[PDB]
Every structure is written in structure tokens, then in C-alpha cells.
XYZ file of C-alpha atoms in Angstrom:
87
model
C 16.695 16.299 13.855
C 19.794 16.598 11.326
C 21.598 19.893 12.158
C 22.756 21.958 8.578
C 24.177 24.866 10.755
C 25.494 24.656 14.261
C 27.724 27.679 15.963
C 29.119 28.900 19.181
C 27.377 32.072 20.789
C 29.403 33.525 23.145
C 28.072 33.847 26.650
C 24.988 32.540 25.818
C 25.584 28.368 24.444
C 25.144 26.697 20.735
C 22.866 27.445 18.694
C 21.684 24.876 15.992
C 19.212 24.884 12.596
C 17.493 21.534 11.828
C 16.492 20.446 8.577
C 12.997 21.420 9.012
C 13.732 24.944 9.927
C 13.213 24.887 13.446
C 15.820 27.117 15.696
C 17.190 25.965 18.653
C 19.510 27.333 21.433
C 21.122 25.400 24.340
C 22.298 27.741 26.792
C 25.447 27.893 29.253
C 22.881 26.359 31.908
C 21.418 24.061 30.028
C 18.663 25.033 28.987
C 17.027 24.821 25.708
C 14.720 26.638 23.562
C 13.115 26.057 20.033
C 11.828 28.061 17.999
C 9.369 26.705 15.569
C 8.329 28.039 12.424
C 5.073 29.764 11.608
C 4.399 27.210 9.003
C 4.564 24.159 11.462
C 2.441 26.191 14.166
C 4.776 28.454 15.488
C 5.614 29.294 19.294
C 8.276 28.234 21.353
C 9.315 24.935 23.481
C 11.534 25.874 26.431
C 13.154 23.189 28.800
C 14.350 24.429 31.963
C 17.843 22.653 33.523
C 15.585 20.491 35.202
C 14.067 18.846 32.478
C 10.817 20.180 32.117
C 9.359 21.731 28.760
C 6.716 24.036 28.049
C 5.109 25.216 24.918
C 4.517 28.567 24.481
C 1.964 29.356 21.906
C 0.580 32.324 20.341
C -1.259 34.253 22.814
C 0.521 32.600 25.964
C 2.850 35.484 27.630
C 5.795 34.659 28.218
C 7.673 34.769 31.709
C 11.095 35.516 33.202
C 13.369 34.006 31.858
C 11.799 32.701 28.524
C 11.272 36.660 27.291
C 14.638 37.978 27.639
C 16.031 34.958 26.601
C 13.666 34.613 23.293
C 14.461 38.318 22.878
C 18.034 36.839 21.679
C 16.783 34.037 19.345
C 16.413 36.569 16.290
C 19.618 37.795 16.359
C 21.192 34.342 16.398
C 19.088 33.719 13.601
C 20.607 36.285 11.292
C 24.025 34.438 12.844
C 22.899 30.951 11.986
C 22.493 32.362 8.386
C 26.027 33.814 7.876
C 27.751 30.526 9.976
C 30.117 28.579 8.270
C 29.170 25.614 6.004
C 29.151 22.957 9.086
C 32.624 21.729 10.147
């Protein structure tokens, strides 16, 4: 969807915000995770390098390495809000 902030995290990948407020991360290995608001259901996709995705609801636990690697999403939030106007 149409990206209104985009940044570099170091050692970790690029981290966008859509439109719509939903989160996402891409990390160094390609992977990529999305947060999705609590008003549009909440959870979490993840797709490993290999391509596959999995939601994560409430109520699902989460395994290695979606935790840790969720664990990081709300700081990069708090960075996505203090990013520079895209570009």
C-alpha cells in the first residue's frame, strides 16, 4: 500500500508505514513482518526468506524468531513517528 514514512534501521532492515496504519519491517534477511492495527483485527503477518507467511493472531504464541523480532517493532514505531517527511 502507499508508504507516508519509510526509514533505515540499522542492523535490523527498512521499516515502512502504509496509509492505513499498518507497520511493516523487512529485515537484513529478508524477511518481513506487519503489524496490523487493533482496529483492522490486529496480530501480526510474518514471511519467512522463503516465502511463506503466517498470521499470528491474538491468542496464537508466538515462536523463535517472530518474538524477539516483534519485541523490536514498537520501538521502530516511536522511530517511524519522528522520521523525516519521506525523501
Amino acid at each position: 500500500n502507499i508508504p507516508i514514512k519509510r526509514i533505515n534501521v540499522p542492523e535490523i532492515g527498512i521499516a515502512t508505514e502504509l496509509s492505513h496504519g499498518v507497520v511493516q519491517v523487512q529485515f537484513y534477511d529478508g524477511s518481513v513482518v506487519s503489524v496490523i492495527p487493533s482496529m483492522q483485527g490486529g496480530g501480526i503477518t510474518y514471511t519467512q526468506p522463503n516465502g511463506t507467511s503466517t498470521h499470528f493472531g491474538k491468542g496464537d504464541d508466538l515462536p523463535f524468531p517472530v518474538r524477539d523480532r516483534v519485541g523490536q517493532i514498537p520501538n521502530i514505531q516511536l522511530k517511524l513517528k519522528t522520521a523525516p517527511l519521506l525523501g
